[PDB]
Short mmCIF file of C-alpha atoms in Angstrom, two decimals:
data_model
loop_
_atom_site.label_atom_id
_atom_site.label_comp_id
_atom_site.label_asym_id
_atom_site.label_seq_id
_atom_site.Cartn_x
_atom_site.Cartn_y
_atom_site.Cartn_z
CA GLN A 1 -4.34 8.59 26.47
CA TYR A 2 -3.94 5.66 28.86
CA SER A 3 -2.45 3.50 26.08
CA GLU A 4 -0.38 6.18 24.29
CA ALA A 5 2.88 5.01 25.88
CA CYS A 6 2.16 1.49 24.63
CA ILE A 7 1.27 2.91 21.20
CA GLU A 8 4.60 4.73 20.91
CA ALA A 9 6.47 1.69 22.25
CA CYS A 10 4.76 -0.56 19.69
CA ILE A 11 5.52 1.90 16.87
CA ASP A 12 9.19 1.88 17.90
CA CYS A 13 9.02 -1.93 18.05
CA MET A 14 7.48 -2.02 14.55
CA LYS A 15 10.32 0.15 13.24
CA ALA A 16 12.96 -1.96 15.00
CA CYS A 17 11.49 -5.24 13.72
CA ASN A 18 11.23 -3.95 10.14
CA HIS A 19 14.79 -2.60 10.32
CA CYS A 20 16.04 -5.95 11.62
CA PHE A 21 14.10 -7.67 8.82
CA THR A 22 15.69 -5.52 6.12
CA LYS A 23 19.20 -5.66 7.57
CA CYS A 24 18.90 -9.43 8.03
CA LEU A 25 17.80 -9.80 4.39
CA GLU A 26 20.73 -7.68 3.20
CA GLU A 27 23.46 -9.83 4.75
CA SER A 28 24.06 -13.22 3.17
CA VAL A 29 26.70 -15.41 4.80
CA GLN A 30 25.30 -15.87 8.36
CA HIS A 31 21.78 -16.87 7.23
CA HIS A 32 20.72 -14.86 10.35
CA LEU A 33 18.78 -17.79 11.95
CA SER A 34 15.71 -17.56 9.67
CA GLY A 35 13.32 -17.95 12.59
CA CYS A 36 14.56 -14.44 13.45
CA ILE A 37 13.23 -13.26 10.07
CA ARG A 38 9.86 -15.05 10.46
CA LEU A 39 9.49 -13.84 14.04
CA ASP A 40 10.43 -10.27 13.06
CA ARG A 41 7.74 -10.32 10.36
CA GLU A 42 5.09 -11.78 12.68
CA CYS A 43 6.07 -9.36 15.47
CA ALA A 44 5.85 -6.36 13.13
CA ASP A 45 2.44 -7.54 11.93
CA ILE A 46 1.02 -8.17 15.41
CA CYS A 47 2.42 -4.81 16.56
CA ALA A 48 0.81 -3.09 13.57
CA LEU A 49 -2.48 -4.75 14.53
CA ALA A 50 -1.95 -3.77 18.18
CA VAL A 51 -1.33 -0.15 17.16
CA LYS A 52 -4.48 -0.30 15.01
CA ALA A 53 -6.51 -1.76 17.88
CA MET A 54 -5.24 0.70 20.48
CA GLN A 55 -5.74 3.68 18.16
CA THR A 56 -9.30 2.61 17.32
CA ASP A 57 -10.36 1.90 20.96
CA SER A 58 -11.39 -1.67 20.19
CA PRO A 59 -13.10 -3.86 22.82
CA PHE A 60 -10.35 -6.48 22.26
CA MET A 61 -7.45 -4.22 23.23
CA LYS A 62 -6.17 -6.30 26.15
CA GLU A 63 -6.20 -9.65 24.32
CA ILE A 64 -4.34 -8.26 21.29
CA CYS A 65 -1.88 -6.60 23.66
CA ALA A 66 -1.31 -9.86 25.57
CA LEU A 67 -0.68 -11.73 22.31
CA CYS A 68 1.65 -8.91 21.24
CA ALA A 69 3.44 -9.29 24.59
CA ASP A 70 3.96 -13.02 23.98
CA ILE A 71 5.19 -12.51 20.40
CA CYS A 72 7.45 -9.63 21.47
CA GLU A 73 8.93 -11.76 24.29
CA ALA A 74 9.68 -14.57 21.81
CA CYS A 75 11.07 -12.19 19.17
CA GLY A 76 13.32 -10.51 21.73
CA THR A 77 14.53 -13.85 23.10
CA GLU A 78 15.35 -15.03 19.58
CA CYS A 79 16.95 -11.78 18.37
CA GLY A 80 19.09 -11.39 21.50
CA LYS A 81 21.14 -14.45 20.49
CA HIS A 82 22.73 -12.53 17.59
CA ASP A 83 25.84 -10.35 17.39
CA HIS A 84 24.54 -7.70 14.98
CA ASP A 85 23.65 -4.27 16.34
CA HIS A 86 20.26 -4.08 14.60
CA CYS A 87 19.30 -7.42 16.17
CA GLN A 88 20.26 -6.12 19.62
CA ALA A 89 18.21 -2.97 19.03
CA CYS A 90 15.31 -5.16 17.87
CA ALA A 91 15.62 -7.29 21.02
CA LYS A 92 15.73 -4.23 23.30
CA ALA A 93 12.68 -2.66 21.63
CA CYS A 94 10.85 -6.01 21.74
CA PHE A 95 11.50 -6.46 25.46
CA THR A 96 10.43 -2.85 26.11
CA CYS A 97 7.20 -3.40 24.16
CA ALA A 98 6.73 -6.74 25.95
CA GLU A 99 7.03 -5.26 29.45
CA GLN A 100 4.80 -2.36 28.37
CA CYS A 101 2.09 -4.71 27.07
CA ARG A 102 2.36 -6.94 30.16
CA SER A 103 2.09 -3.89 32.45
CA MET A 104 -0.82 -2.63 30.33
CA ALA A 105 -3.08 -5.70 30.08
CA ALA A 106 -4.35 -6.93 33.44
CA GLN B 1 16.65 8.64 6.60
CA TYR B 2 15.46 10.28 3.38
CA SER B 3 11.90 9.02 3.96
CA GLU B 4 11.73 9.47 7.76
CA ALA B 5 9.71 12.69 7.49
CA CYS B 6 7.19 10.87 5.30
CA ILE B 7 7.19 7.96 7.78
CA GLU B 8 6.34 10.24 10.71
CA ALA B 9 3.76 12.10 8.61
CA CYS B 10 2.11 8.82 7.61
CA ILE B 11 2.11 7.60 11.23
CA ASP B 12 0.38 10.84 12.27
CA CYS B 13 -2.04 10.37 9.36
CA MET B 14 -2.73 6.78 10.50
CA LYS B 15 -3.49 8.03 14.01
CA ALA B 16 -5.71 10.84 12.70
CA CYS B 17 -7.64 8.51 10.38
CA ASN B 18 -8.18 5.90 13.11
CA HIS B 19 -9.27 8.63 15.55
CA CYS B 20 -11.72 10.01 12.97
CA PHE B 21 -12.98 6.45 12.39
CA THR B 22 -13.63 5.84 16.08
CA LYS B 23 -15.15 9.27 16.74
CA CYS B 24 -17.34 8.93 13.64
CA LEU B 25 -18.54 5.51 14.84
CA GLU B 26 -19.33 6.90 18.29
CA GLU B 27 -21.72 9.62 17.10
CA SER B 28 -25.07 8.47 15.76
CA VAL B 29 -27.40 11.17 14.47
CA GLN B 30 -25.34 12.73 11.62
CA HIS B 31 -24.44 9.40 9.96
CA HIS B 32 -21.09 11.18 9.27
CA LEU B 33 -21.24 10.65 5.45
CA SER B 34 -20.28 6.94 5.49
CA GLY B 35 -17.86 7.38 2.60
CA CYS B 36 -15.83 9.27 5.22
CA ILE B 37 -15.72 6.07 7.30
CA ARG B 38 -14.79 3.84 4.32
CA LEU B 39 -12.18 6.32 3.12
CA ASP B 40 -10.73 6.69 6.63
CA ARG B 41 -10.37 2.91 6.86
CA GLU B 42 -8.79 2.60 3.40
CA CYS B 43 -6.50 5.57 4.09
CA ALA B 44 -5.35 4.11 7.41
CA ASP B 45 -4.68 0.77 5.71
CA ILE B 46 -2.75 2.24 2.77
CA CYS B 47 -0.78 4.44 5.19
CA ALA B 48 0.03 1.40 7.33
CA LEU B 49 1.24 -0.36 4.18
CA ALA B 50 3.21 2.76 3.16
CA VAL B 51 4.86 2.89 6.59
CA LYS B 52 5.66 -0.82 6.26
CA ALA B 53 7.12 -0.32 2.78
CA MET B 54 9.18 2.74 3.72
CA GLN B 55 10.49 1.09 6.89
CA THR B 56 11.49 -2.08 5.01
CA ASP B 57 13.22 -0.26 2.08
CA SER B 58 11.05 -1.96 -0.53
CA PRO B 59 11.72 -1.49 -4.27
CA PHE B 60 8.08 -0.35 -4.65
CA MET B 61 8.34 2.61 -2.27
CA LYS B 62 7.45 5.33 -4.78
CA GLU B 63 4.38 3.58 -6.23
CA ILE B 64 2.91 2.82 -2.79
CA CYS B 65 3.63 6.42 -1.79
CA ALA B 66 1.91 7.78 -4.92
CA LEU B 67 -1.16 5.62 -4.25
CA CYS B 68 -1.07 6.79 -0.62
CA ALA B 69 -0.91 10.38 -1.90
CA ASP B 70 -4.03 9.83 -4.03
CA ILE B 71 -5.96 8.14 -1.21
CA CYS B 72 -4.87 10.82 1.28
CA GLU B 73 -5.95 13.60 -1.11
CA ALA B 74 -9.39 11.97 -1.49
CA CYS B 75 -9.75 11.31 2.25
CA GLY B 76 -8.80 14.89 3.07
CA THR B 77 -11.18 16.29 0.46
CA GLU B 78 -14.02 14.16 1.85
CA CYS B 79 -13.26 14.78 5.55
CA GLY B 80 -12.89 18.54 5.09
CA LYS B 81 -16.62 18.84 4.32
CA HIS B 82 -17.51 18.06 7.95
CA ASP B 83 -17.95 20.30 11.00
CA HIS B 84 -16.43 18.01 13.63
CA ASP B 85 -12.97 18.79 14.99
CA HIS B 86 -11.62 15.26 14.57
CA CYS B 87 -12.64 15.32 10.91
CA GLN B 88 -10.81 18.63 10.41
CA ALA B 89 -7.71 17.20 12.11
CA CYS B 90 -8.02 14.12 9.87
CA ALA B 91 -8.26 16.34 6.79
CA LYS B 92 -5.25 18.44 7.82
CA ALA B 93 -3.12 15.35 8.51
CA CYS B 94 -4.28 13.77 5.24
CA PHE B 95 -3.34 16.84 3.20
CA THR B 96 0.03 17.03 5.00
CA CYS B 97 0.70 13.35 4.23
CA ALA B 98 -0.51 13.92 0.65
CA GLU B 99 1.84 16.82 -0.02
CA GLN B 100 4.66 14.89 1.67
CA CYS B 101 4.08 11.81 -0.51
CA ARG B 102 3.76 13.95 -3.66
CA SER B 103 7.00 15.79 -2.80
CA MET B 104 8.64 12.44 -2.03
CA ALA B 105 7.76 10.35 -5.10
CA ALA B 106 9.14 11.75 -8.35
CA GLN C 1 -19.23 -10.24 -8.86
CA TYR C 2 -17.23 -8.53 -11.61
CA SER C 3 -14.03 -8.76 -9.53
CA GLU C 4 -14.59 -12.21 -7.97
CA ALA C 5 -12.20 -13.92 -10.40
CA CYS C 6 -9.51 -11.40 -9.45
CA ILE C 7 -10.35 -11.95 -5.76
CA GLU C 8 -9.86 -15.71 -6.04
CA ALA C 9 -6.71 -15.23 -8.13
CA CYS C 10 -5.28 -12.84 -5.53
CA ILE C 11 -6.15 -15.24 -2.70
CA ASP C 12 -4.32 -18.03 -4.55
CA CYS C 13 -1.42 -15.61 -5.11
CA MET C 14 -1.40 -14.75 -1.38
CA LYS C 15 -1.23 -18.45 -0.52
CA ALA C 16 1.52 -19.08 -3.08
CA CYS C 17 3.60 -16.12 -1.90
CA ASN C 18 3.27 -17.11 1.77
CA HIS C 19 4.14 -20.72 0.93
CA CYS C 20 7.21 -19.57 -1.03
CA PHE C 21 8.14 -17.33 1.93
CA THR C 22 7.95 -20.19 4.42
CA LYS C 23 9.69 -22.73 2.19
CA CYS C 24 12.41 -20.20 1.37
CA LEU C 25 12.94 -19.54 5.09
CA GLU C 26 13.17 -23.26 5.81
CA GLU C 27 16.05 -23.97 3.41
CA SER C 28 19.44 -22.62 4.39
CA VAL C 29 22.29 -23.23 1.95
CA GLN C 30 21.04 -21.43 -1.21
CA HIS C 31 20.12 -18.16 0.58
CA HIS C 32 17.20 -18.14 -1.95
CA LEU C 33 18.08 -14.67 -3.39
CA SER C 34 16.71 -12.63 -0.44
CA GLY C 35 15.00 -10.16 -2.75
CA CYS C 36 12.70 -13.12 -3.45
CA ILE C 37 11.80 -13.17 0.26
CA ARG C 38 11.26 -9.37 0.46
CA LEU C 39 9.25 -9.38 -2.77
CA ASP C 40 7.17 -12.36 -1.61
CA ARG C 41 6.33 -10.52 1.61
CA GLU C 42 5.47 -7.26 -0.18
CA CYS C 43 3.44 -9.15 -2.81
CA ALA C 44 1.47 -11.04 -0.15
CA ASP C 45 0.79 -7.77 1.67
CA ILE C 46 -0.32 -5.85 -1.44
CA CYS C 47 -2.47 -8.82 -2.47
CA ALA C 48 -4.05 -8.93 1.00
CA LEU C 49 -4.79 -5.21 0.64
CA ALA C 50 -6.13 -5.77 -2.89
CA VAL C 51 -8.42 -8.54 -1.62
CA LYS C 52 -9.56 -6.21 1.18
CA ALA C 53 -10.20 -3.38 -1.29
CA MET C 54 -12.06 -5.54 -3.81
CA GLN C 55 -14.16 -7.19 -1.10
CA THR C 56 -15.11 -3.82 0.42
CA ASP C 57 -15.99 -2.12 -2.93
CA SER C 58 -13.54 0.72 -2.37
CA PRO C 59 -13.38 3.70 -4.77
CA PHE C 60 -9.63 3.00 -5.19
CA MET C 61 -10.03 -0.53 -6.53
CA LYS C 62 -8.33 0.03 -9.90
CA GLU C 63 -5.26 1.83 -8.53
CA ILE C 64 -4.62 -0.83 -5.87
CA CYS C 65 -5.12 -3.50 -8.53
CA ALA C 66 -2.65 -1.78 -10.90
CA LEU C 67 -0.05 -1.55 -8.12
CA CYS C 68 -0.74 -5.22 -7.30
CA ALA C 69 -0.22 -6.02 -10.99
CA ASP C 70 3.18 -4.29 -10.96
CA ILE C 71 4.30 -5.99 -7.74
CA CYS C 72 3.03 -9.38 -8.96
CA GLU C 73 4.89 -8.95 -12.28
CA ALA C 74 8.12 -8.17 -10.39
CA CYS C 75 7.63 -11.01 -7.89
CA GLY C 76 6.95 -13.49 -10.68
CA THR C 77 9.96 -12.30 -12.68
CA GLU C 78 12.19 -12.67 -9.62
CA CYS C 79 10.77 -16.02 -8.44
CA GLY C 80 10.93 -17.58 -11.91
CA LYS C 81 14.75 -17.51 -11.79
CA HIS C 82 14.78 -20.26 -9.13
CA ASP C 83 14.84 -24.06 -9.40
CA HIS C 84 12.57 -24.89 -6.46
CA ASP C 85 9.02 -26.05 -7.15
CA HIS C 86 7.38 -23.68 -4.66
CA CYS C 87 9.13 -20.74 -6.34
CA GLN C 88 7.83 -21.86 -9.75
CA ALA C 89 4.31 -22.18 -8.32
CA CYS C 90 4.71 -18.71 -6.79
CA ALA C 91 5.84 -17.31 -10.15
CA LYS C 92 2.94 -18.94 -12.01
CA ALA C 93 0.37 -17.65 -9.50
CA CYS C 94 1.98 -14.20 -9.58
CA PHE C 95 1.83 -14.00 -13.38
CA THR C 96 -1.78 -15.23 -13.33
CA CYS C 97 -2.70 -12.55 -10.75
CA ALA C 98 -0.73 -9.99 -12.77
CA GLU C 99 -2.54 -10.69 -16.04
CA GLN C 100 -5.85 -10.77 -14.13
CA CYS C 101 -5.19 -7.37 -12.52
CA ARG C 102 -3.99 -5.89 -15.83
CA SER C 103 -7.11 -7.21 -17.61
CA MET C 104 -9.24 -5.90 -14.75
CA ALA C 105 -8.00 -2.32 -14.34
CA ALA C 106 -8.52 -0.17 -17.43
CA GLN D 1 -2.89 -29.33 5.42
CA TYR D 2 -4.10 -29.73 9.00
CA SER D 3 -5.23 -26.08 9.12
CA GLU D 4 -6.56 -25.77 5.55
CA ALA D 5 -10.19 -26.11 6.66
CA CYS D 6 -9.64 -23.28 9.15
CA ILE D 7 -7.91 -21.25 6.41
CA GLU D 8 -10.88 -21.59 4.06
CA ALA D 9 -13.32 -20.89 6.91
CA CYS D 10 -11.40 -17.74 7.86
CA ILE D 11 -11.28 -16.59 4.23
CA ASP D 12 -15.06 -17.02 4.01
CA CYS D 13 -15.36 -15.15 7.32
CA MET D 14 -13.16 -12.34 5.96
CA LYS D 15 -15.40 -12.06 2.90
CA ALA D 16 -18.57 -12.12 5.02
CA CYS D 17 -17.25 -9.48 7.43
CA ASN D 18 -16.12 -7.18 4.61
CA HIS D 19 -19.47 -7.63 2.83
CA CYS D 20 -21.34 -6.82 6.06
CA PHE D 21 -19.07 -3.77 6.49
CA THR D 22 -19.81 -2.45 3.01
CA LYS D 23 -23.54 -3.20 3.14
CA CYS D 24 -23.78 -1.62 6.59
CA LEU D 25 -22.01 1.50 5.31
CA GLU D 26 -24.36 1.72 2.34
CA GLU D 27 -27.58 1.86 4.36
CA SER D 28 -28.23 5.05 6.30
CA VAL D 29 -31.38 5.14 8.42
CA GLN D 30 -30.81 2.23 10.87
CA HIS D 31 -27.26 3.31 11.87
CA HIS D 32 -26.64 -0.50 11.96
CA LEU D 33 -25.42 -0.52 15.62
CA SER D 34 -21.94 0.93 14.91
CA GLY D 35 -20.26 -1.60 17.18
CA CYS D 36 -21.24 -4.03 14.41
CA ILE D 37 -19.12 -1.97 12.00
CA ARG D 38 -16.12 -1.73 14.39
CA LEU D 39 -16.36 -5.43 15.24
CA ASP D 40 -16.66 -6.38 11.55
CA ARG D 41 -13.51 -4.39 10.79
CA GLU D 42 -11.57 -5.88 13.73
CA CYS D 43 -12.81 -9.39 12.88
CA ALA D 44 -11.78 -9.04 9.24
CA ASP D 45 -8.35 -7.79 10.32
CA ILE D 46 -7.76 -10.55 12.89
CA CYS D 47 -8.97 -13.13 10.35
CA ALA D 48 -6.60 -11.71 7.73
CA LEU D 49 -3.79 -12.01 10.28
CA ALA D 50 -4.93 -15.54 11.17
CA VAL D 51 -4.91 -16.53 7.49
CA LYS D 52 -1.43 -15.00 7.18
CA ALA D 53 -0.20 -16.87 10.27
CA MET D 54 -1.69 -20.22 9.24
CA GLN D 55 -0.39 -19.90 5.68
CA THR D 56 3.12 -19.03 6.88
CA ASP D 57 3.33 -21.84 9.52
CA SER D 58 4.07 -19.42 12.34
CA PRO D 59 4.95 -20.67 15.85
CA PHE D 60 2.09 -18.50 17.21
CA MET D 61 -0.66 -20.18 15.21
CA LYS D 62 -2.75 -21.39 18.16
CA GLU D 63 -2.73 -18.09 20.07
CA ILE D 64 -3.75 -16.06 17.00
CA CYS D 65 -6.44 -18.65 16.29
CA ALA D 66 -7.76 -18.46 19.87
CA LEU D 67 -7.91 -14.66 19.68
CA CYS D 68 -9.64 -14.99 16.30
CA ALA D 69 -12.11 -17.40 17.93
CA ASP D 70 -12.92 -14.85 20.65
CA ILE D 71 -13.32 -11.97 18.18
CA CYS D 72 -15.41 -14.13 15.83
CA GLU D 73 -17.67 -15.21 18.73
CA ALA D 74 -18.21 -11.56 19.70
CA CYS D 75 -18.76 -10.43 16.10
CA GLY D 76 -21.27 -13.22 15.51
CA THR D 77 -23.11 -12.47 18.76
CA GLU D 78 -23.32 -8.78 17.82
CA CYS D 79 -24.26 -9.31 14.15
CA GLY D 80 -26.94 -11.90 14.96
CA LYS D 81 -29.07 -9.20 16.60
CA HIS D 82 -29.80 -7.60 13.21
CA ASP D 83 -32.54 -8.22 10.64
CA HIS D 84 -30.48 -7.75 7.47
CA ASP D 85 -29.49 -10.80 5.45
CA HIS D 86 -25.83 -9.83 5.11
CA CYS D 87 -25.59 -9.49 8.90
CA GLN D 88 -27.08 -12.97 9.34
CA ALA D 89 -24.61 -14.38 6.81
CA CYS D 90 -21.81 -12.57 8.67
CA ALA D 91 -22.99 -14.06 11.97
CA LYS D 92 -23.21 -17.58 10.52
CA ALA D 93 -19.73 -17.36 8.99
CA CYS D 94 -18.36 -15.89 12.23
CA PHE D 95 -19.80 -18.71 14.34
CA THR D 96 -18.48 -21.29 11.85
CA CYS D 97 -15.00 -19.72 12.00
CA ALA D 98 -15.29 -19.52 15.79
CA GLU D 99 -16.13 -23.20 16.24
CA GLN D 100 -13.41 -24.09 13.72
CA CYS D 101 -10.78 -22.06 15.59
CA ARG D 102 -11.93 -23.45 18.96
CA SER D 103 -11.78 -27.02 17.60
CA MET D 104 -8.38 -26.24 16.08
CA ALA D 105 -6.49 -24.66 18.99
CA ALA D 106 -6.07 -26.98 21.97
#
């Protein structure tokens, strides 16, 4: 139960990254800074792995959470440069998951 | 929003399958009917893929949800034969996710 | 060993779909028919799950392989409409994996 | 092409970890030191993510490869304590993938 807050934060960050992925693929004219798409995919995959590792009580919980913190920091810093509302929600959820994973792993 | 109930049910089924995986790996003397472990892993992986496909609005949402319904039916039918409380919770969450995916895909 | 040809074909299809994903994200002016990007991601994920299910001898091998056949048929039919060489390689690997999964599952 | 050797080594390590998972779940009387099963699952999942990140040319290639090196070192050190041939093959593939990921990331 000591990682449940980080589990719920990473599930919300998964949902925000997948929503930003889909709503960036729907729009066409901006090109949405395609590193945002690649980073949203890699952030959703590392957050899915972090949820899987925290829910299974793995002995590599802190290292996966530190890597997820780094990827979430980069995904938030790249998605915050956009004007769309889904990208701002993705950046806010990524920074929340990043500060949660940095406060978790020590 | 028309698949959000199935998304939350599959996230609860992911958590229940991973918890049954970990608590079946912790105990030693029963051997916990190792098909339960393999089916809990495959059910958690197909439910993670189903959550990823429903959150990304994929064109193959119904087929992944029907496969997730079949795997959740089998995982519930195999985990319901056990006396442990985590296995009964896993079976109840798997049957809830199974009836949700069967009511969803049509 | 009776699914090893399908395992190697799905690994080659994973590599081709990820390469088409990356080389579609690199180019900017075409927009690369963003359904190609979404289908390449979903095809790489279902082929990773199919490789995981065939390598673990799961009881749901044929259903995952039939779903992988459907997704590979759709990804090949959508990537074959493009002029880029990586998209043509992705379409050829997807149709090879599709005919291998359709000849496998029966 | 500068990570293709690590990609093939991680694919062989995925196959060895999944084979050790399945052949540890088949046998019953040893109990196969269930941390071996959990570590084989987590090693196969981090190696699948490392293959996905190296095949997609992600900007977080070195960090995922260093985490995969740590998990492969631990999985090899835990699987080398067993007498079964699949566990020894899993340990040899894990140490090969570990030295490849440690020679790769710098």
